[PDB]
Structure formats: C-alpha cells, structure tokens
Design a protein around this nucleic acid. Sequence first.
RNA 1: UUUAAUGUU
Length: 341
Amino acid sequence: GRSRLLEDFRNNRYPNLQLREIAGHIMEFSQDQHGSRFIQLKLERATPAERQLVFNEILQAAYQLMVDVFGNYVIQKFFEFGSLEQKLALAERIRGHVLSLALQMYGCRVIQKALEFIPSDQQNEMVRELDGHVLKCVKDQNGNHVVQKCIECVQPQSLQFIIDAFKGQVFALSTHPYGCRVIQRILEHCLPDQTLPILEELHQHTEQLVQDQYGNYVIQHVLEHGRPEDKSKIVAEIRGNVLVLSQHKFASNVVEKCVTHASRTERAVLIDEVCTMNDGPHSALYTMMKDQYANYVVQKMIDVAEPGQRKIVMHKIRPHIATLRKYTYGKHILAKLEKYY
RNA sequence: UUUAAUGUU
C-alpha cells in the first residue's frame, strides 16, 4: 500500500533525497522500515526549522507512531534533541494513554524516553496515570521497565503511590523476575522515609529470600548499599547458618557480602562461627575451602579477618593443603595461605 | 572456580 515516492525511495531512486522533499509523506515514511531510518538520520543533522517541518506531520497522529514498530523511533528522537515546546506537545498527546503505552511493546519506549527528558511538572502528570496499576506494570515484561524509569528520573515524593502499592507485597515481588529489579531501584532512589516500610517487610522474610533465585539479589543490595542498622539485621539472620548457606547456590553470595560489609565486630563473629565449628568428622573450614560456592566466603574471610583471627583460620587450613592443591574451587585460598608461610 | 529480565529499528 506504499506510495510511488516511497517505493521509489526503496528502489534507491533518490541517493540524495532530502527531508524538505518528502514533505507531506513524513507519516508514511515514519512507518516504513527504511523511510523511518532515513528520517532518523536526516533529523540527526538537520536544522531546527527543518525538524519543525517534520514535527508538524507527526504531531496529530503521534499516538499511532508511538505504538508503531518503526515510528517509535521518530517520536523518540524529538524527546532527545527536540525543543521544549515539541516535547510538551508530545507529552500532551500522551496524556491519557500512559498506561496502555507503558505496557506496549513499542510505546513503553517512548514513555521511558519521555520520562528522561520532560520537566518535573510534566513527569508528575505522566506518573499519576499509573496509580492503581503499579503491580500490573511491574509484572509486565514492558511495564516493569517503565515503573523502573520513573523511580530513576522522577522526584521521589511523586512516587509515593509506588511505595504504598508494595504494601504487603515485598516478599511476593522479591521472588518475582521483574519485581526484584524494581525493588532494588526503590532501595537506590526512594527517600529514607519511603524505604523504611519496604526494608521492614524484607527483614521479615530475610531467610527465605537469601535462598531464592531473585531474593538473594535484593538482600545483597541492602548489604552493599544499605544503612548499618539494616546490614546488622541481615547478618543476624545469617548467623548460626554460615556453613550451610555458604554452600547454597544462592545464599552463599549473601554470606559473601556479609563478611565483606558487616561491622568489624560482626565480621569477627562470622569467622569465629566457622572456625570454632566442625562439620562432619571434619573441620568446618575444610568443607568450605573445597566447595564450589563456599570457597569464596573463606577468601572473603581471610581478607577481612584481623591478625589474631586471621592466623587462626590459616592454622585451620594448613593441615589440608595437599588436599586443597588439587581443587581448582581451592586455588585462591591456598594462594592466600602461602602469602605468609 | 561464583545466580539473576526470553524488555524494538
């Protein structure tokens, strides 16, 4: 259903075709695979007035391009290099479609690009349309990215409805593929008063989360970027289980971060547990040093352990070298242990 | 030797 001029363009019958020249066809070229690219590149080094000529032809049926496989690129360009006015107009064409577009394979982009470039006032307007639909968005393959961009670009006090939406859902969403990524954004960007009710629910389930394919990434984040009081809680839930969680494919990464981020005093108590403890008819460190996952925790322990504590652990391992040497899940520990012969 | 999203030209 193309046009002569467009078929024409595809036949390379215009090696030097200009923007000014496809006027009255901006809409048709925007929904074409080559036409759209063409416009996209001509816009990148076009004059303001020229871009305006194109902008005019895409404004009215702007929503149609926003959800089009090829036109989602053209609208985006205007959000990146367009004038303030052009952006407020596009944002105006978005008003009332925010939700549908945030869940659309192509629209979600546009929404994300717009959230990154429009002023706070227009961002706050756009974000409201999502209130009451936050979970549906988080669980959507396209929507989770939008919810996510809001948190990164929009003022925190405008995202209060996001926090409320998570009320009694933190556990359910931490063990969700997209939900965990959103929660980590919240922990990184939302305010102190807002993050508190989220952390409260995580602590309540902290044990089940270190063992989840996703949950263990949320707890690791608290340890790497959270408040000491928060870290303290986690390490306290890990204590008494250092040995077993260290060998778990998922929780072992958390105990790793615990040994690395906890407080002095706590760090010494984690080393003391595995040191003053025994596994089978064999040493606790013996099991960890040759284990696929636990071996990293011992490495972490050797580094952060303090003089007195550190030799102890070296006196615990020294009797098992011959064995350690033949374990590739053991060439870094060993390596430590040699640094002081 | 260590785990994460089947998010577009």
